[PDB]
Amino acid sequence: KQFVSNVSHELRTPLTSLRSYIEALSDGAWKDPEVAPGFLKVTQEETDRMIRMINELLSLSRTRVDMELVNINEMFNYVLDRFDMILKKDDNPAKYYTIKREFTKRDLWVEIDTDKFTQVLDNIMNNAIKYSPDGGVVTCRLLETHNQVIISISDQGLGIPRADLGHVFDRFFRVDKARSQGGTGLGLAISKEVVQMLGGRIWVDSVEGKGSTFYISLPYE
Amino acid sequence: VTEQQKIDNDRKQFVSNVSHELRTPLTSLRSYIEALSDGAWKDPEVAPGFLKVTQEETDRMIRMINELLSLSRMDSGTTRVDMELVNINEMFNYVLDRFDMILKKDDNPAKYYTIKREFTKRDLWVEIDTDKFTQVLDNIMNNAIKYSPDGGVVTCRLLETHNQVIISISDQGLGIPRADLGHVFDRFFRVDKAQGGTGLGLAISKEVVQMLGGRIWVDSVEGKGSTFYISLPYE
Ligand SMILES: Nc1ncnc2c1ncn2[C@@H]1O[C@H](COP(=O)(O)OP(=O)(O)CP(=O)(O)O)[C@@H](O)[C@H]1O
Ligand SMILES: Nc1ncnc2c1ncn2[C@@H]1O[C@H](COP(=O)(O)OP(=O)(O)CP(=O)(O)O)[C@@H](O)[C@H]1O
């Protein structure tokens, strides 16, 4: 049943991603030859991914990671692409949310599990938007230093209490204050151990009035 | 130890069912997406039709995920319930008012239905969670409307006894087999239909009503109709 809670949570980003592209296609993009095949490709990939997700989360209930060498620039770019589409077909005024990308010009190659790591990126990107009720710009950086590849995601949202910067990675822990709104508290806990499974590190810095920055570090080579 | 056994076995089939039930819309989706990708997107007489179906399968899964989440919070005691003293007469009336309002707008209604109200005349004040309890009434009212003949009457009663507040909602449909009066509240139990409709509604409603300290059950005679009951402890 821990299966049920986890799969319910983790299916939310792909379903939202899937619906956004379907609505874009439905809104008229299906008539447009230079975008429709690309959009359809994303829906096909997200649908297949959700099926891969359902089966594996059920098997875990009975150290299963699929490591491949990946170009993080391209993947993170792909992940952000899905969120851009989400934001363009959302209920909010255009430019109410913005994803700013600041990637290094180098191509960074890292050993990760593509499906499991995507879940991590989805959770944090979801958080950055969801806890930015008054809108905001999300800043996503990608760089390598000291043999580590580092991803950072910054928001102009609500902050995180300094006392709770450690607790946000705990399972079912949610910040107990009021917003301008919250769910289970499973996102960052799940996200943390996937990063730890990949040999990485995750941490957060925040100012309670202006926003937060989450960090992921992965082994380079 | 058949106790812990039955607990562990109910859980295993539920989990299997959730795997199967989430897998099915996605597989349908995959087929439509491949048809579109294989070339149907270029075709104006099928592409819009296909896209709508994919949208519905997606929407249905979102309703499923949300319902699976309500059940998981309930299954863990994470659910936050707020018992407050409210006028049940007025609340039930508002629920019925909103359903009445829907039918009074002519989107060439699929099926015309009538709601007869038989409320007690004393005003009943009770501790409940209005938001969660309203959800239950909608679920039963939706069912009552969905499974009633064309021109049928839905009978909504509110009555009190020394120790119980009783709400009953009756439909004039084909009813429910005596063997399935308990089973209709089980998770994923739905009429044989092989889009929409999860079969989690009454399961959620049973656990919400039980959460509020109440009781829910159904009586039916095949061919004549069904009556659903909600009992809440009075004063
Ligand atoms: N950018 C941000 N700004 C402010 N608070 C944040 C934040 N990112 C996370 N948090 C807080 O830290 C906690 C992280 O827990 P987690 O994200 O697992 O809960 P959750 O899964 O219910 C969020 P969601 O419903 O969007 O998936 C949240 O309760 C949230 O309040
Ligand atoms: N008033 C009624 N009369 C006859 N059968 C009913 C009924 N209410 C429910 N049922 C049957 O019991 C099962 C459980 O109903 P429930 O309302 O939980 O399904 P659901 O969650 O998909 C909402 P809906 O069926 O209105 O879309 C359904 O499959 C339905 O066939």
Residue numbers in the entry:
A (entry chain B): 383 to 444, 450 to 567, 570 to 610
B (entry chain A): 372 to 565, 570 to 610
Paper excerpt:
A typical TCS is composed of a sensor histidine kinase (SK) and a cognate response regulator (RR), which are encoded by genes that are often clustered in the genome.
To obtain ATP-bound states, we crystallized the lpWalK fragment in the presence of the nonhydrolyzable ATP analogues AMPPCP and AMPPNP. In addition, the γP of ATP was visible when lpWalK was co-crystallized with AMPPCP but not AMPPNP. Interestingly, the interaction between Lys476 and Ala406 in lpWalK is not found in smVicK as Lys476 is substituted by Gln301. Together, our data indicate that WalK adopts a closed structure in the presence of ATP analogues or ADP, which is characterized by the asymmetric positioning of the two CA domains; only one monomer of the dimer switches to a closed conformation while the other one remains open. Only one monomer folds into a closed state through an ∼58° rotation, while the other monomer remains open. ATP/ADP fits into the active site of the CA domain through extensive interactions involving the N box and the G1 and G2 loops. We have found that ATP/ADP interacts with His391 in the DHp domain through hydrogen bonds in the closed lpWalK. A magnesium ion was not identified in the ATP/ADP-binding pocket of the closed lpWalK structures. Two coordinations by the hydroxyl groups of βP and γP are lost in our lpWalK structure bound to AMPPCP, which makes lpWalK unable to chelate Mg2+ stably. The DHp domain is sandwiched between two CA domains.
